[PDB]
């Protein structure tokens, strides 16, 4: 049997195939203690057991199949790989591997590796030959995503006021400036129903750090793709450990030419946590802020590229501020310019109960004119020029208003020429 | 007998019964000692003896049951629990057992467990078989619990007050940030006579952490629900424990498909005592917080969830400020966002001698429409237009004087309307 279908069942499923076949005490357990014992149960009858999971190195040398069901925390059920299957295949942190695995030895505590039969979702012998990520040339963002699902409405607006603003490609590094219950969560909701609905070939991945756990439910729940994320319950160092996860999968499944978008909810919070975690270096900025702190996060947001060899990495990253806390404030200023999109909500906006809170003026994005075509940039430049002169709340009442007249943003466009 | 009516029994009753079965000396020591010399008294005439408790697992193996009564404070009066009681009866820190109780024989300190009875207010062998409570899907409140009480005190005006700023719900995490002499402690009373009287179903739970103890004794003589508080002249070992029985016996609860309701005071106070108790990481942020000392209260606070399966755990905190001390203001940075609910309170509307003291425009509450109706939720919003352009003083001072000329909510929002 297969342990990404058991860790796909729910733990009363779960409990009543344990007790069936044998095994008692299952319900006040962990999910990853049953899912271990019905793997040794069905092991000691000898049938070929299957397994996956993204392999995290360790320190030591070896290394463990990781499971983003549980968004890759260390479990009694994880996959143990030795380093000589880490050095027969070269593997890295990241890598998706596929295969059959066998029950513990006496002497063994863990599920160990049998055969390799999947490496990053191909042939180990053609994963074996992919150039590292660090090796690709960086560029601007060509192919666009659009937003606009043109499937739903009375929300919709959030898309079509995206595609208006702030334009996502393949590639881009884009960050959400904005205040706590400004919309940003719902608003990266909405985002990841547009990717998931306008292009289904891109990998989605969520990724959120210190999120209350009913948000987690709903977010796994509601988006199609991958979500991973670290409730403020765990330390720190849980924190950490699901961003290096997240960007080495995303790195490995790009170096396969294939576009990856991570969500990320929030870049400030993952700052605070490496501060958390690093040790202190003996400069330490303003707001508690450690100088050398702020290195690895930068290093997650500046991964994202367009690959000129093939595929892309998209990271939309949320930034929070007028938290009440400086250090927050000291982290966006670090994060200022590194990326090349922005969109920026505002309180004042949300505060009317009237949304997207998208601030149109201070919104915008680097190297525009690759993602879309000469007419359509003009028409956005004068959408510009008439935006311009209002105020926030002005201009998103407007915007409201006029697109809520018309059904897609063409017609909108027309409109505003006529 | 059952112990625990001796151990309600008021300590001058219980020294007579002593006197009476043919004890003495019992008058200059701990009522815990007198109720333990009653029991070994009485034990040696030969009936049965009865007992309930809260089972706390120690680190030996073994567990104790503790009592509510003295804030499951460990004494002679514990019962023993075996190891081999703890693997026959699938059994967890938290789980509420009633049943026979027997003499300590020689070389034995304590009563141990005779015959288990009742397990979680269930049959032993139905306990076994609830699923624990991590393995639960969490989910935003969606049952509203109404603050409004019909009794009508018509002075008071403060379940009124909190029905119109922040909504409570069950499974709801809610923080409540006051400075000191705002108003903290009757407003805990009022949430607990709101909950006592409109939910009756509901467990009610209130957690005092470094509590004055005559403030302790009136919320024990007020609430109608569980007060297991922990006075400041205690160490901080203490707080920690009594904070994990509480906490360990609400998910039990929960797990068995029960809302339980905790009230917190405070939060900082609880996230100090773990931080003097936990041992230092090297990682000290500032005003000498211990990195992973904010690790285990968040635990406790990240506890509240609304169950899909069934049940509900709401938990109600209060958090300090200007209180002068940094270690203050950085507990409430790492838990100013962990909530679904806040509720200010303001100094400057408390010393103004107007009651409640709540800062209408900082305080809300996540996912409000799940909780009420879409016209609540329109008369709502209309409210909170209406207040915002206001000083909270002001802002308080009309409300109050609005409230007063209405007997319920509802007739409130239609003079609002007229
Ligand atoms: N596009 C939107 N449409 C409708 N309501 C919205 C929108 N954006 C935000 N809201 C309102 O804001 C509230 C909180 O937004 P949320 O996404 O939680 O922001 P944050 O993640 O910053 O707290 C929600 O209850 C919702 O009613
Ligand atoms: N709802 C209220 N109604 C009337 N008086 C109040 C109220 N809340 C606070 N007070 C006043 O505050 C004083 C102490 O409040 P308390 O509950 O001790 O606050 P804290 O717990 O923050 O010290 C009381 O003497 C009382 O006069
Ligand atoms: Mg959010
Ligand atoms: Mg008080």
């Known amino acids: 049997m297969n342990l990404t279908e058991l860790k796909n069942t729910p733990v009363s499923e779960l409990i009543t195939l344990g007790e069936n076949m044998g095994l008692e005490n ?6 990853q203690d049953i899912i271990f014992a019905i793997l040794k149960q069905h092991a000691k009858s000898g049938e070929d057991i299957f397994g996956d999971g993204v392999l995290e190195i360790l320190q030591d040398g070896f290394g463990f199949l990781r499971s983003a069901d549980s968004s890759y925390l260390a479990g009694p059920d994880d996959i143990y790989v030795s380093p000589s299957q880490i050095r027969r295949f070269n593997l890295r942190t990241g890598d998706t591997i596929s295969g059959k695995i066998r029950p513990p030895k006496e002497g063994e505590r863990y599920f160990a590796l049998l055969k390799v039969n999947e490496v990053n979702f191909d042939k180990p012998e053609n994963a074996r030959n992919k150039i590292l990520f660090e090796n690709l040339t960086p560029l601007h963002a060509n192919s666009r995503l659009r937003m606009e699902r043109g499937n739903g409405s009375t929300e919709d607006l959030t898309a079509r006021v995206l595609d208006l603003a702030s334009l ?8 959400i400036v904005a205040p706590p219950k400004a919309g940003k969560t719902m608003l990266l909701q909405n985002i990841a129903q547009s990717i998931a609905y306008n292009h289904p070939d891109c990998v989605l991945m969520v990724l959120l750090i210190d999120e209350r756990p009913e948000e987690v439910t709903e977010m796994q729940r509601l988006v199609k793709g991958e979500v991973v994320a670290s409730t403020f319950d765990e330390p720190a160092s849980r924190h950490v450990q699901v961003a290096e996860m997240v960007i080495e999968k995303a790195k490995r499944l790009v170096e396969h030419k294939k576009d990856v978008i991570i969500l990320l909810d929030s870049i400030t919070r993952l700052a605070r946590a490496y501060n958390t975690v690093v040790p202190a270096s003996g400069k330490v900025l303003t707001g508690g802020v450690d100088a050398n702190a702020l290195h690895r996060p930068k290093r997650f947001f500046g991964a994202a590229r367009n690959v000129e060899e093939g595929g892309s990495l998209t990271i939309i990253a949320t930034a929070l501020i007028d938290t009440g806390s400086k250090m927050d404030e000291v982290i966006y200023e670090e994060f200022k310019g590194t990326g090349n999109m922005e969109l920026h909500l505002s309180r004042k906006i949300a505060e009317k109960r009237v949304f997207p809170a998208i601030d149109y003026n201070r919104s915008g994005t680097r190297k525009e004119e690759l993602l879309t075509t000469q007419e359509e940039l003009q028409k956005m430049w004068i959408l510009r020029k008439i935006i ?17 007249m018309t059904k897609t943003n063409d017609d909108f466009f027309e409109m505003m020429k006529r």
């Open 388 to 404: 311009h002169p209002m105020g926030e709340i002005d201009a998103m009442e407007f915007l409201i208003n006029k697109l809520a």
């Open 168 to 175: 996502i490609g393949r590639g881009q590094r884009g960050l």
């Open 26 to 31: 299952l319900a006040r357990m962990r999910k």
